[PDB]
Design a protein around this ligand. Sequence first.
Ligand SMILES: [Ca+2]
Length: 101
Amino acid sequence: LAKLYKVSNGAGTMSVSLVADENPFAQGALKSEDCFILDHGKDGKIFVWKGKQANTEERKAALKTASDFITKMDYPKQTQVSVLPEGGETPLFKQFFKNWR
Ligand SMILES: [Ca+2]
């Protein structure tokens, strides 16, 4: 099962927190103020979703963390993080969500 993480410094430190571990995810789980990491790394699918109002530190932290997941969770070494902006989501990303519209 995929997991969805929030990457945010809104609470006073940069934090990577779990927001969803049941599949499929709510489309409204993606909040424009932050970045999110969708981890389905077992088959090499890891996404960074960049909320339009996230800040530079959050974007940088989400990319670094998603890349770190490859090493720390022992995902396939050729895994490439898929980076998506809010509003530029691909079918492969949307398939993880319930009734994306
Ligand atoms: Ca934020």
